[PDB]
Design a protein around this ligand. Structure first.
Ligand SMILES: Nc1ncnc2c1ncn2[C@@H]1O[C@H](COP(=O)(O)OP(=O)(O)O)[C@@H](O)[C@H]1O
Ligand SMILES: Nc1ncnc2c1ncn2[C@@H]1O[C@H](COP(=O)(O)OP(=O)(O)O)[C@@H](O)[C@H]1O
Ligand SMILES: Nc1ncnc2c1ncn2[C@@H]1O[C@H](COP(=O)(O)OP(=O)(O)O)[C@@H](O)[C@H]1O
Ligand SMILES: Nc1ncnc2c1ncn2[C@@H]1O[C@H](COP(=O)(O)OP(=O)(O)O)[C@@H](O)[C@H]1O
Ligand SMILES: [Mg+2]
Ligand SMILES: [Mg+2]
Ligand SMILES: [Mg+2]
Ligand SMILES: [Mg+2]
Lengths: 443, 49, 426, 426, 436
């Protein structure tokens, strides 16, 4: 379940075997130095040895830094946790800011435990269940077949109860798990003898299973560290895993959990898969948060943190002095900064073509040039938004291609920041100013 | 570490050393032989304040 | 194989028996005077005599305050409690800052006790109720058989655990906990297909008794005496799901817990292990926290709290006109002993880089290591420290083991420093 | 109450004679002649109990024994009388209003003694017959030092003894009225007289405790958990009127106590406004206030104040001023502190410590004593020599020297504007 | 007995015609203020007007709290009087407006009388009977129960409902137990065992109680004073219910909640109905707000709105500052720290400072009530000290002088004792000078 989002066009970093960024691949365009740095960080993360490094992504708005993070996440792929949060999420009311940050960090450490399970899988030949009226004793036995073997089993009380709950019928194909005891109906073998109800709802036949009737299979349990913390924090913590409201979990629990996980790793019971945490608009964070971040990176079970910021020199929140990137020098000294540059014209034109391809919008060459010129003049995001509006205008025109006139109409109807600013400056009397004065009447 | 073990070793009673070796081998083979892993549970206070 | 962090190479203070510190021991380079002071403090802590002592590690950034704290924690050993903190942690939302601070204070004081565990473990042979009525249950073990009378709470636990006759059960007398360990092996062939898990009949006698040693803290006792924490009864469930948030533990409860601990020590069943509390970013603390910390230092039962600060002549948070040596008001400053930590010259920076490379399993050419050391001298030591991993990644991409100068220059061109970014912004 | 060594452990009293004239050095207290005289006058006023709602301020330089004086007053007052010493930063809570907290603090220092006469039999034990319905027939025998006699039980006594499962040959205490049964170990000990004794037990509680006891269904848990909540004012009025009635009846006596706020400079103007009225009413204790700052802006106000307190409170208070210690007083206080800490200092070492404390701070030398003792322990020396004190001075810094070090190198520290020179080069 | 700051104030000290004697009821001076307080006390005793407000305005140590407590004493224990301070309004559980509303209603007392009939005594017989026909009822078919009670004046045989029998079974009552039955509700209470059967068993845990005095069936008329806030609390947090949910709620802390206006409306309706029948009468009391300067602007505005209610006590205010900015506002300088709109609703009672003679008389009275004897010369020294620094300083300095005199085993305080007390304890001006 997904829709075409602002970063839906990028499927990775698009790098070669020698970490040399391809000029355009996997959706990403240009930004070669930053993509190379991202690839180096990617290899460091995939190695899994370096812990608690902090990396900062800096540069002007719209220069793809959040796209760079999305590409990094796509390169990580599944089975490696990636927690993307914003600075605005940290300031909560039910948790201390350091508690919220701790919960965020522990969401970024993944534990994989592999287990081997014995599985029975069959076609049902017949099932029998002898239960005494006004009595609790029940007797049953099951016959279950495979293409190469058939066997009978005599059923215990719990197995009888489970099979009765599942309403197994002989024309079912089903698997039996000897440990869990759950029964899953895989499909149907033949028809229901044409009873006068449920006539043709079983047409989707399934093939008989083949091989040993009782076969061993492996199951992998992927769980984050934060989930384990919530599970072991209190008795009601499992409900809190979905409801929230976990409370401010005691630190001693965290210390014991860290020791236990360290023992599990050294024992080979569990495999730890650290991931990457991405913070958006970090400058929103408080100096108390950055103070906690300084120590939090030093921990051995910490992920690798990447921070997006663009405000340049600005007053750090909680203090009365400006700081080089909105962040204190305490955090700035311990972090490696990767930079992003403004885009050339050709990079913008190819980004626009890629976005139109992703949105399934067919742009004519002259229309593509006009849209690129508009994007170069004002902003890449503005032209990106204009693409879909032009497509809708073309559809309204009953044409299968987007022409230049559609783009012109979209420009005329919908404004950019500069045009709105100019129209405001010309007509300041029609809007409410900071001093609370405005003319509502026209005479 | 157990001082009595050291004393036993010092004794030089070949039997005693053989027994010590046997205990070492048992410990290495599976800890349950030497001491079952104690099932950890909370400390119990006699009475609340 | 193994993961590496900021202080993976820090194994100890490396101080001799006389207390003098060698130039290079325990992974430390230089800072001999601070190491000697920290060793004296370690002796003071190990004496287990004074309470509430506080010292301040004052120095610039990237100078070795957290390294010294972690080295003290390692040297003292895992027996003692060492609790690192940032001041930001104190600013809780559920309870006041005083409650969090006092909880951290008593959490840093350790208690080691001896307890006897009474254990019963059996397969079940009869289930008779004494009629909520006591239950009569028979149990056997490899050495013999026994019949037990259990309290109604245990009866509720057994009923809610879906124990059958012929099940094997574990009862811990101290807590009254009933755990179904599984089904006896003797009934393995009772059916062909059931969800039963079969366990063998327990070895030995039905009743066993063993003496363990368990480590607890004063805060653990406070929590135990404050709210219900375990149990398999619905009464326990309701008791613990009520009032879930933390509460401001009163001074009376702490006094009673202290009296109980004194009684235990007098009886010899318990021993005290005073520990250390470390607070970092102490400048984050408001004037109220410092004001109460003044009171806690005079308390008769307090750990050896150490303070780290790295700001000078900065105003105290909360206050508007108090200029203090390190953001610490003069009232608390008089309660502290200040340990000065000094910056690093070029040779020590080079040695530190070499040791870090050796620890993280990297191979560095002498010229490349010299270039890295001189660029760390130019900008910052930590900058050189974090560049090591990208350099190692770059070397692997060239199918080459040892780090060369080209990798270092490429890493510098790829990743920039804070000063370079500030210049770019300008 | 077992605890380690603090910085005030030596104070075993206020050191007054019959004529309230303090001796130069007694009960741990040196000098401070007028301060100790005033503290003794306050102590006698508290013991008399005929004066209510008096506030005393302790004044003069920080580290001049204001807390030491208050502790001396608390210890000289002895037990069986409330003395609450709370920091001003404990008042501000997220669960209790500041006014509610101040009210609870005032009431906690007013004690009420209520006598309960209970009929309890204390005896050594002899065989017990319990029989089924023939509701139940049972007999027990108790032995004491001079009697051995049979009691015939009833239904509830039989039920209680069955629940307790009392054995024989041990020692048991049973209360006739309450019905509680207290077990005791085997006869080391033995009954000492009559089987049934009439001894009264006295219970010491405060008004706050009574308020909490009547506050809820099971409010007595709040006396330990601290989640009392804002009690209704009608509840307090009921407690007040019932306590007045009990005092009139002569079945309970009131023991007024002392409330100590150690850091009054943290309460806001609202707290002072409430305090002004809380002193006036009856059942108001005597409040001891200590402040070190001369003239500052009161918290919650934008103007300075003569002591950090509004003039309305200053009109209602009497101020005790403390002189700074002289060199001789410093020397003898250091002698007492060293004797308390079990440190054998030399004469020249004692003189050097005296001059060091006079130059910088008494607290600094007091903390340096233990550091010096540990330093000497590394040299396997019993007596502390001069070189140990010099090494302690060199390794651990005082406030002024650290300030000088920071001042001369302010570039490598973080300044108020957030600037720092991390680069060792340039 | 303990001696508070306003212990010596025994009354307003007024004549039948309203004139106040120069020295009566512990008061010294303040003739005009005392007369105004007498008029206000008459207005309160009239019990006709609602929402009237007056302000006791004067400097620190002038007698605002003294006048408030004198008014409380003069009104008597049958008139509500809720003391308060301005800072207590700032709650953390509910808005300050709700706390002001709650306290404001506390000062409207209601006196409700109820006649109750109770059956009490020692049980002698208990013979449950079934219905005359088995078809008469369902299941057990238990009919009335007959109980015999014994009192100091005789015995009576009662016929009880099966519900009362169920209550008896619940309370676990046996023969000889002293019981207590309320015909008003059908509630049975088990007082205990009779002292007659105290020595039946030589060791038994039973609360033996004496045989009830008077008749077995005594009818009494009970009169109690309950506040409107009491009814509001009873409706908001009822104590009824014996379910597990009820017990769990009982264990919870009684946090204040914003009681809706609808509940007050219903309470007002029911109280009006019962007063209409004549059973109960309404007694508007007095609410005292000391240090009105500390209130926020929102609290002042809600005070403005509260005075427009139909039921409202006479709020008396104290302020010791002038031309002071109102808390919670940046620019509004106001006469007494009270917003100008609220001042327009107030009546200011000006209180004037004292001279040397009044201070001398006050010191005399304070020393008398303190069980301390003071010499005339030492008393003149104390009066000069008080007029030099402050009266309250001397009034508090009386006690250390007495203690010092006792330490010298002297019956009366001497001038040297006053000098030594001066040396021991300083004042605000002297402390400020010594700190400079
Ligand atoms: N180098 C790039 N390659 C492909 N798409 C890009 C690139 N840079 C930016 N974009 C796209 O342009 C839009 C704006 O980039 P964005 O990441 O929002 O910039 P910023 O992170 O500075 O806000 C997004 O849709 C993003 O995917
Ligand atoms: N003397 C030293 N020897 C070896 N490594 C050091 C030394 N000082 C610092 N480091 C390394 O550099 C990091 C910075 O030290 P740190 O203690 O964080 O400085 P500070 O706490 O003063 O800011 C440490 O985490 C450690 O990994
Ligand atoms: N007169 C005295 N005799 C002995 N020790 C004293 C005396 N005055 C102060 N001290 C000690 O010196 C230290 C400082 O006293 P303290 O009461 O904390 O100062 P302040 O209250 O002014 O901050 C404490 O260890 C205290 O025990
Ligand atoms: N008219 C009076 N006659 C006798 N004593 C008085 C009189 N007025 C005030 N006092 C005494 O002096 C004190 C000052 O009055 P008080 O109300 O406390 O002043 P404030 O205005 O500060 O509240 C009172 O507590 C009382 O003990
Ligand atoms: Mg972005
Ligand atoms: Mg640090
Ligand atoms: Mg002090
Ligand atoms: Mg007053």
């Amino acid at each position: 379940l997904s829709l075409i989002a602002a970063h839906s066009h990028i499927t990775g970093l698009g790098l070669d075997e020698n970490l040399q960024p391809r000029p355009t691949s996997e959706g990403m365009v240009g930004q070669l130095q930053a993509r190379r740095a991202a690839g180096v960080i990617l290899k460091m993360v995939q190695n899994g040895t370096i812990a608690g490094r902090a990396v900062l992504v800096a540069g002007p708005p719209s220069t793809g830094k959040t796209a760079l993070a999305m590409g990094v996440s796509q390169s990580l792929g599944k089975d490696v946790p990636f927690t993307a949060i914003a600075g605005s999420e940290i300031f909560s009311l039910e948790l201390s800011k350091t508690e919220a940050l701790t919960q965020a960090f522990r969401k970024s450490i993944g534990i994989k435990i592999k287990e081997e399970t014995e599985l029975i899988e069959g076609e049902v030949v017949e099932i029998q269940i002898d239960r005494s009226i006004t009595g609790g004793h029940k007797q049953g036995k099951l016959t279950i077949k495979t293409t190469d073997m058939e066997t009978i089993y005599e059923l215990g009380n719990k197995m009888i109860d489970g099979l009765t709950k599942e309403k197994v019928l002989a024309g079912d194909v089903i698997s039996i798990d000897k440990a869990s005891g759950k029964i899953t109906k895989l499909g149907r073998s033949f028809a229901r003898s044409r009873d006068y109800d449920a006539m043709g709802a079983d047409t989707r036949f399934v093939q008989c299973p083949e091989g040993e009737l009782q076969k061993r299979k492996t199951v992998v349990h992927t769980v984050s560290l934060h989930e384990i913390d919530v599970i072991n924090s209190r008795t009601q913590g499992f409900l809190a895993l979905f409801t929230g409201d976990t409370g401010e979990i005691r630190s001693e629990v965290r210390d014991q959990i860290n020791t236990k996980v360290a023992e599990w790793k050294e024992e080979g019971k569990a495999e730890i898969v650290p991931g990457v945490l991405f913070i958006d608009e970090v400058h929103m964070l408080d100096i108390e948060c950055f103070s906690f971040i300084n120590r939090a990176l030093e921990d051995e079970f910490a992920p690798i943190v990447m921070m997006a910021t663009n405000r340049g020199v600005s007053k750090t929140r909680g203090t009365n002095y400006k700081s080089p990137h909105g962040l204190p020098l305490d955090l700035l000294d311990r972090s490696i900064i990767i930079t992003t540059k403004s885009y050339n014209e050709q990079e913008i034109k190819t980004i626009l073509s890629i976005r139109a391809q992703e949105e399934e919008v067919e742009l004519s060459s002259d229309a593509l040039d006009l849209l690129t010129k508009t994007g170069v003049e004002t902003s890449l995001r503005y032209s990106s938004n204009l693409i879909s509006v032009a497509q809708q205008i073309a559809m309204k025109r009953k044409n299968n291609t987007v022409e230049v006139e559609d783009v012109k109409r979209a420009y005329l109807l919908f404004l950019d920041s500069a045009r709105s600013v100019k129209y405001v400056q010309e007509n300041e009397s029609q809007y409410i100013d900071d001093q609370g004065n405005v003319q509502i009447s026209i005479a | 570490s157990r001082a009595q073990t050291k004393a036993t070793l010092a004794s030089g009673n070949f039997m005693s050393i053989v027994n010590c070796l046997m205990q070492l081998r048992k410990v290495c083979n599976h800890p349950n032989l030497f001491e079952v892993r104690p099932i950890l549970t909370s400390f119990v206070l006699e009475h609340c304040v | 194989v193994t993961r590496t962090a900021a202080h993976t190479h820090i194994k100890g203070l490396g101080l001799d028996e006389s207390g003098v510190a060698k130039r290079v021991e325990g992974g430390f380079v230089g800072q001999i005077e601070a190491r000697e002071a920290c060793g004296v403090i370690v002796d003071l802590i190990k004496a287990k005599k004074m309470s509430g002592r506080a010292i301040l590690l004052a120095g610039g950034p990237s100078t070795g305050k957290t390294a010294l704290a972690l080295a003290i924690s390692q040297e003292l050993g895992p027996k003692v409690p060492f609790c690192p903190l940032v001041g930001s942690e104190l600013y809780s939302v559920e309870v006041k800052k005083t409650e969090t601070l006092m909880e951290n204070f008593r959490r840093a004081i350790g208690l080691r006790i001896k307890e006897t565990k009474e254990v019963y473990e059996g397969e079940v042979t009869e289930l008779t109720p004494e009629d909520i009525s006591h239950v009569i249950v028979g149990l056997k073990s490899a050495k013999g058989t026994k019949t037990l009378r259990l309290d109604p709470t245990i009866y509720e636990s057994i009923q809610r655990e879906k124990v059958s006759i012929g099940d094997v059960i574990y009862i811990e007398a101290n807590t009254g906990a009933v755990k179904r360990v599984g089904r006896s092996d003797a009934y393995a062939t009772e059916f062909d297909l059931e969800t039963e898990e079969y366990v063998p009949l327990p070895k030995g006698e039905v009743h066993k008794k063993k003496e363990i040693v368990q480590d607890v803290t004063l805060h653990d006792l406070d929590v135990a005496n404050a709210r219900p924490q375990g149990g398999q009864d619905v009464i326990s469930m309701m008791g613990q799901l009520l009032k879930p948030k933390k509460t401001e533990i009163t001074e009376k409860l702490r006094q009673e817990v202290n009296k109980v601990v004194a009684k235990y020590i007098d009886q010899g069943v318990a021993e005290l292990i005073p520990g250390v509390l470390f607070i970092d970013e102490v400048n984050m603390l408001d004037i109220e926290i410092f004001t109460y910390l003044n009171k806690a230092l005079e308390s008769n039962i307090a750990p050896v709290v150490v303070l780290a600060s790295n700001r000078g002549m900065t105003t105290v948070r909360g206050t508007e006109d108090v200029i203090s040596p390190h953001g610490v008001p003069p009232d608390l400053i008089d309660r502290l002993l200040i340990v000065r930590t000094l910056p690093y010259d070029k040779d020590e920076i080079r040695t530190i880089i070499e040791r870090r490379a050796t620890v993280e399993r990297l191979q560095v050419e002498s010229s490349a290591l010299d270039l890295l050391a001189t660029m760390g001298t130019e900008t910052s030591l930590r900058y050189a420290l974090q560049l090591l991993a990208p350099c190692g990644i770059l070397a692997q991409t060239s199918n080459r083991k040892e780090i060369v100068v080209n990798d270092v220059n490429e890493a510098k061109l790829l990743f920039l420093d804070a000063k370079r970014s500030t210049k770019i912004l300008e």
